[PDB]
Design a protein around this ligand. Structure first.
Ligand SMILES: O=P(O)(O)O[C@H]1[C@@H](OP(=O)(O)O)[C@@H](OP(=O)(O)O)[C@@H](OP(=O)(O)O)[C@@H](OP(=O)(O)O)[C@H]1OP(=O)(O)O
Lengths: 238, 225, 228, 502, 217
């Protein structure tokens, strides 16, 4: 009653609208996984298409904010595209002002500031999308950063966003409890294994979209169906 | 319209004030309410001179009265600037009334909450008396009252106001005293008088100055019996 | 009513008495020492409110005074300064966020001499020979109306009166110089002197009040005995 | 044990333990007060300890929590206090019923009958119990006095102790002498809070001191001499005629004043007469007046001496005249009941001492003076009822100028107070007894010498008095209507309104 | 009532993680728990402690995004002052302005108040300083406080353990004790964030020295 209908404090001090946005992210109905390695970072997520007519190519939840930065979005698609657009804008503005490519942490920070503005202001509903970012930082090497609608942003050795993020995170915690310093193939296998386990799907290569960054090749890249199938078949014979 | 009713009740609560119009004189009287044991009576005026040729008495909320008075003073000066002539009492009345129907910056109590008596001498020299309302309606009067008990005073003014009463300027002053005396039972220092005295600036009466006038009517009251 | 302030007019001067109090032991109290805020050389104020509200109100006031000084190169009159603040606090009333504090103002103006003013939260203001604000303002004004003589005040008598009414009103339960803040406005050599009372002078005044209370206690016990 | 923590003499306790003990004493909003236990043994332990905790040295009154705790203790005690014991004597019938109740043998075990020695032991125990209770009452009173005046105490604790003493007003027994002296001494005290508290206390005391007035029995049919038939119709009747006010029937002499009934209550006689009537027997039967100052025991004596003190009367009068608030002031019926109790108990003792003060007060044009003198004037008038004819004659000779000047000087600030004064003076009194007030007030309400608003306020206080005299003044209402009828067409608005009300 | 939102914001603050401040003679400490929801969360990435200026740093208990907003504003304000006056901002002045913005936001309609309380520390004029700026806009000056969970418990523990004169090391210790009371357990360099203000300037204690201080207990 006027506390849940707008972004204002509950008696216990809680932002129900923000909780509802976190619910909306799961209402979107897709899962994303991110994991970090000594030499690389990767993203995996399912891109199951309901309609045959709908083009598989155009639909993807992986985007390029900059050449060296790749992101994945979950939740409401329109909000995801808007967030992606704003991230692109901020990155270019950063480059223009400061003469060097924005680091992933600063980008996540800016985006979280923007989400903060919506949660603070009543007129705007919180943007119901969650962004995970991968990039290579020269000082710290690969990095993974994740910004919620609320504005909390934190670095992650590995993480998940989606309907099964909880079980995914349990799996990732079990995996990283052992040190398991992962090379590129190991990170890829780890990510796909997390998703295949948590969704119980046993993906075909077309089902999933994969993007990575490497210290050798900082350029963000989207793996093609064939390389994805190579990784999956190497996994299956294991 | 709803704020207007609250404003009208507020001015109804306020201190009584009257004004009279005379041929070479206009008089303005307001009862001086007791303040406290320890307060200083200086700050409270209930009378203001918008210009040399205009005087005002308000009834109602003091702060809103302050705002109105300041705005009207600055308007009086700006009109003098643009027109090079003394402001007309009708004009400044029209502005103060017009100021009521802008509003507060938030529009809260769009009527500011005072009905005030504006009295002055025209540039041609003709005396004028007016009042304003929170509503914004403004009228002219031979004489009037505002504040608590004004209605009873208007009955007294209705009969007492006459060519004979106004024939003498000092009598023009004394009539105001009697009007207040009906309104206020203090019969003394609880009163404030101001007179324009055509072609000269407003001169507030001294406490002794009012005192002798009070004595004179008190004697004349004695003389009738 | 977190705080209390007090003010008295004298023929030769004016003083502000405020209860320097610590809600909690951990509070440093070096920062909160300055209950008295100097608006300018010729004025001061004491606030019945939190330090933040006080800082903002005081800044508005100081800005106003310095603007008047910039225009005219004369120090501002107390009435005009208080009136500007009152007009602002009123305009907030007309926002829906009226100023929630009442202030004392003390100053010397050549036009009116020594003066003491009080500002209501509604924006209305009034001149007082002596008054208190904040906690137990009602008891304070009662004792002042009892113990104050119009025109008979001198700075010394007024100061002792302040100590007395503070002892009755404020909840210190024992006067300490650390626990009370006193400041006086005086005119010396044609210049306005705002001086906080030193801890030693405050201790001396406290001791005078204490011995006077003892001497009074002796008299009442004697008279009570004599009655029976 | 819980009182041990906040004991003053004890040291090393702590601020925290002190606060915890205060919370224990405060208790929850609902349940055992833990400081207002009905037990006499518990209260004597608690209340002195609460007041004595001021000088504990483990108490930081600067603590807002601490001061709010003490205020909460005070408010909770004041609201939840009930009268405490002092007598537990069962009457003879109830023990008979109990004797039957033991005898009933159907759901009963055959316990041996209570022996006479046991019954003697029981009454012995009960007598010792109520005596110990009275002892505890007196001890608590003395102890709280010692607490409120030990010279190391803060003012808040002093105020609290004075309130607690205010609670101990007893109505079975007079208060202890030292306490009565303390309260009457506090009438002139610097703190307004303490002053009002003392006022209410001493008015209660004056009711305690009040000597019972003998009341004779009359037959209303006989005194009237009318037939008084059955199936009587309410209202004015032949039998109620003596009760009805009349100009000819005013006594105007000592003999007639002695002869007059002076029922002093309006409501008797409209509808039907009671079975037994009470009419305040002759002055000889009543308690003596004009006491020598030797007669009074000790409690009346101290009040008498303080009020005889002119410095005391002057200081008290000046304190009453002092304004508490501007525009929010009222009649203060407690101050009124005090002054009535004074004049009633001591029978015109101190009107000579007060007369300078009254003559000064009515002269002053300030509102608060008029308020105080009005309370005093009406308290005096109400006390006057049991006074003899000569005493009241002198009193009204005193009062008439004071009232004339007061009404002439009524104003906007004072009109409500003076109307309250006139109504309270008029209330619960025979009209013939108060004929002076009516003849004065009705002399010229619509004088017009003062002007309008004062003619109105005169009519207003008049209407108040006549309202108090319901159905006992058909005459004087006819007179008001006759005086009023010409002036209907020569009148202003405020007067017209009050004219309609009257 | 707008005040209701202020009360709810204070409750939201009280829900926040513990933050502790102690004012030594020669230095001020600021400490807080930064307990990580999971091992996956990387502690090094984000610091609850952050410096406004070289000589000033602060810590928060409450909503992190609100804290990021306020620290950005404070940094800009201090730099504004430094441009004007070419001297470092005083701690009280900064606290006042930060209170100004908090008060501005809550006063403004259509926007909620900040859900955080800040503890602001600095060293200037050869002196230590400590302040707490609440959501209402009120600022107070303390020798020591705690915020967040069990803040009253921390405050009384501080009251019993405090001394008017103490060294920076002893104040570091008593801060860490205070947090050790509230903390769930297994306190370590990663789980706890520390900063000190002194003549040297504000600095966030590195994990190595924080491990040294923890080992001292
Ligand atoms: O019969 P009592 O209990 O002794 O009290 C009556 C009576 O009181 P009751 O109506 O309760 O009998 C009167 O009327 P109240 O005002 O008390 O209702 C009167 O008071 P007034 O003088 O104000 O009329 C006065 O009561 P008190 O003694 O409390 O003043 C009087 O008592 P006495 O009969 O003892 O004179």
């Amino acid at each position: 009653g006027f506390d849940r209908h707008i972004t204002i404090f509950s008696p216990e001090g809680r932002l129900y609208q923000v909780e509802y946005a976190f619910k909306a992210i799961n209402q979107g109905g897709l899962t994303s996984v991110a994991v970090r390695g000594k030499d690389c970072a990767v993203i995996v997520t399912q891109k199951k298409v309901p309609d045959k007519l709908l083009d598989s190519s155009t639909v993807t939840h992986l985007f390029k904010i900059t050449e060296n930065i790749g992101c994945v979005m979950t939740g409401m698609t329109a909000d995801s595209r808007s967030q992606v657009q704003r991230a692109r804008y901020e990155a270019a503005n950063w480059k223009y002002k400061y003469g060097y490519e924005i680091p992933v942490d600063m980008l996540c920070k800016r985006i979280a500031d923007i989400s903060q503005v919506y949660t603070q202001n009543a007129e705007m509903r919180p943007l119901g999308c969650c962004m995970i970012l991968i990039g290579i930082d020269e000082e710290q090497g690969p990095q993974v950063y994740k910004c919620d609608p609320a504005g909390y942003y934190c670095g992650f050795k590995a993480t998940a966003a989606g309907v099964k993020q909880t079980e995914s995170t349990s799996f990732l915690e079990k995996k990283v409890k052992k040190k398991f310093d992962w090379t590129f193939e190991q990170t890829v296998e780890t990510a796909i294994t997390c998703l295949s386990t948590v969704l119980s799907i046993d993906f075909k290569p077309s089902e999933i979209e994969v993007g990575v960054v490497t210290v050798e090749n900082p350029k963000f890249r989207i793996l093609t169906e064939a390389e994805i199938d190579a990784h999956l078949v190497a996994l299956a014979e294991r | 319209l709803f704020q207007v009713e609250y404003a009208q009740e507020a001015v109804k609560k306020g201190s009584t004030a009257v004004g009279v119009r005379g041929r070479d004189i206009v008089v303005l009287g307001v009862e001086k309410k007791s303040v406290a044991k320890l307060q200083d009576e200086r700050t409270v005026r209930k009378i203001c001179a918008l210009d040399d040729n205009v005087c005002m008495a308000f009834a109602g909320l003091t702060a809103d009265a302050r705002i109105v008075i300041n705005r009207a003073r600055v308007e009086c000066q700006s009109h003098r600037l643009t027109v090079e002539d003394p402001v007309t009492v009708e004009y400044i009345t029209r502005y103060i009334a017009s100021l009521k129907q802008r509003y507060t910056q938030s529009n809260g109590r769009r009527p500011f909450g005072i009905s005030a008596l504006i009295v002055g001498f025209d540039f041609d020299g003709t005396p004028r008396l007016y009042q304003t309302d929170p509503s914004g309606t403004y009228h002219a009067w031979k004489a009037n009252a505002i504040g608590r008990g004004a209605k009873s005073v208007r009955e007294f003014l209705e009969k007492n106001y006459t060519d004979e009463a106004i024939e003498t300027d000092d009598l023009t002053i004394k009539l105001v005293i009697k009007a207040l005396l009906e309104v206020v039972q203090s019969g003394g220092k609880n009163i404030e008088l101001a007179v324009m005295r055509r072609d000269q600036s407003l001169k507030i009466l001294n406490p002794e100055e009012i005192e002798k006038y009070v004595a004179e009517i008190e004697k004349e009251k004695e003389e009738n019996e | 009513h977190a705080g209390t302030c007090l003010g008295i007019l004298a023929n030769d001067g004016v003083l502000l008495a405020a209860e320097r109090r610590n809600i909690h032991k951990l509070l440093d109290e070096v920062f909160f020492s300055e209950k008295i805020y100097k608006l300018n050389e010729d004025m001061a104020c004491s606030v019945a409110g939190i330090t933040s509200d006080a800082n903002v109100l005081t800044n508005e006031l100081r800005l106003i005074a310095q603007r008047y000084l910039l225009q005219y190169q004369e120090p501002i009159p107390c009435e005009q300064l208080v009136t500007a603040l009152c007009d602002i606090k009123q305009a907030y009333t007309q926002g829906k966020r009226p100023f929630g504090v009442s202030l004392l103002y003390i100053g010397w103006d050549k036009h009116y001499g020594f003066q003491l003013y009080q500002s209501d939260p509604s924006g209305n203001y009034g001149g007082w020979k002596a008054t208190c604000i904040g906690n137990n303002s009602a008891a304070a004004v009662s004792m002042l109306k009892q113990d104050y003589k119009e025109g008979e005040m001198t700075l010394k008598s007024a100061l002792a009166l302040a100590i007395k009414v503070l002892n009755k009103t404020m909840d210190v339960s024992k006067l300490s110089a650390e626990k009370v803040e006193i400041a006086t406005l005086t005119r010396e050599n044609g210049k306005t002197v705002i001086r906080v009372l030193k801890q030693k002078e405050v201790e001396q005044l406290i001791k005078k009040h204490e011995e006077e209370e003892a001497k009074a206690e002796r008299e009442k016990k004697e008279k009570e005995q004599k009655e029976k | 044990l819980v009182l041990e923590f906040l004991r003053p003499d004890r040291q090393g306790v702590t601020q925290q333990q002190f606060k915890g003990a205060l919370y224990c004493l405060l208790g929850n909003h609902s349940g055992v007060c833990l400081a207002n236990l009905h037990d006499w043994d518990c209260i004597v332990q608690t209340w002195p300890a609460i007041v004595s905790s001021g000088l504990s040295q483990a108490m930081s009154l600067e603590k807002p929590s601490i001061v709010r705790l003490f205020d909460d203790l005070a408010e909770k005690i004041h609201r939840q206090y009930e009268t405490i014991g002092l007598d537990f004597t069962i009457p003879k019938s109830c023990v008979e019923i109990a004797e039957l109740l033991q005898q009933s043998k159907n759901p009963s075990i055959n316990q041996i009958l209570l022996s006479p020695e046991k019954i003697k032991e029981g009454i012995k125990r009960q007598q010792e119990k109520n005596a110990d209770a009275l002892r505890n009452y007196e001890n608590l009173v003395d102890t709280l006095l010692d607490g409120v005046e030990q010279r190391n105490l803060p003012w808040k604790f002093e105020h609290i102790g004075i309130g607690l003493l205010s609670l101990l007003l007893r109505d079975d027994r007079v208060l202890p002498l030292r306490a009565i002296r303390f309260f009457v001494e506090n009438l002139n005290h610097d703190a307004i809070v303490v002053r009002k508290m003392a006022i209410s206390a001493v008015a209660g005391i004056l009711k305690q001191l009040k000597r019972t007035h003998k009341k004779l029995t009359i037959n209303p049919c006989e005194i009237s001499g009318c037939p008084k038939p059955t199936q009587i119709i309410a209202g004015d009747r032949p039998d109620n005629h003596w009760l009805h006010y009349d100009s000819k029937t005013i006594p105007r002499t000592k003999k007639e004043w002695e002869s007059s009934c002076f029922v002093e209550k309006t409501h008797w006689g409209y509808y039907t007469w009671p079975k037994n009537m009470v009419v305040y027997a002759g002055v000889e039967e009543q308690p003596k007046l004009g006491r020598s100052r030797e007669d009074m025991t000790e409690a009346e004596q101290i009040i008498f001496d303080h009020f005889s003190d002119p410095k005391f009367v002057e200081q008290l009068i000046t304190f009453l005249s002092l304004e508490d608030r501007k525009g929010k002031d009222k009649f203060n019926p407690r101050r009124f009941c005090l002054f009535k109790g004074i004049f009633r108990n001591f029978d015109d003792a101190f009107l000579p001492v007060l007369k300078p003060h009254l003559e000064h007060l009515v002269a002053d044009s300030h509102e608060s003076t008029q308020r105080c003198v009005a309370e005093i004037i009406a308290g005096l008038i109400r006390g006057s009822k049991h006074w003899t004819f000569e005493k009241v004659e002198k009193l009204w000779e005193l009062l008439c100028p004071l009232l004339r000047t007061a009404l002439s000087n009524i104003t906007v600030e004072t009109y409500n107070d003076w109307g309250a004064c006139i109504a309270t003076s008029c209330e619960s009194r025979d009209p013939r007894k108060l004929h002076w007030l009516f003849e004065l007030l009705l002399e010229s309400p619509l004088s017009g010498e003062g002007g309008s608003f004062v003619d109105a306020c005169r009519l207003y206080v008049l209407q108040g008095g006549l309202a108090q005299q319901e159905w006992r003044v058909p005459e004087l209402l006819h007179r008001l209507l006759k005086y009023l009828e010409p002036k209907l067409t020569q009148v202003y608005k405020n007067v017209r309104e009050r004219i309609g009300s009257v | 009532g707008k005040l209701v939102q202020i009360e709810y914001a204070l409750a939201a603050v009280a829900g926040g993680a513990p933050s502790v401040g102690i004012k030594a003679a020669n230095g001020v400490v600021l400490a807080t728990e930064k307990k990580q929801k999971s091992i996956l969360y990387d502690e090094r990435s984000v610091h609850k402690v952050e410096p406004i200026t070289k000589h000033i740093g602060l810590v928060y208990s409450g909503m992190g995004p609100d804290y990021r907003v306020l620290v950005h504003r404070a940094r800009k304000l201090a730099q504004q002052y430094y441009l004007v006056y070419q001297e470092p901002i005083p701690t009280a002045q900064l606290v006042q302005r930060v209170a100004s913005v908090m008060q501005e936001y809550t006063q403004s309609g259509g926007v909620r108040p900040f859900g955080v309380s800040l503890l602001i520390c600095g060293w200037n004029e050869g002196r230590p300083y400590l302040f707490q700026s609440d959501p209402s806009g009120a600022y107070f000056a303390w020798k020591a406080t705690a915020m967040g969970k069990n803040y009253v418990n921390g405050k009384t523990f501080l009251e019993k353990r405090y001394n008017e004169d103490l060294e920076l090391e002893d104040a570091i210790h008593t801060a860490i004790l205070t947090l050790k009371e509230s903390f769930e357990g297994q306190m370590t360099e990663d789980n706890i964030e520390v900063g000190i203000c002194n003549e040297a300037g504000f600095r966030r204690l590195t994990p190595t020295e924080v491990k040294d201080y923890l080992a001292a207990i």
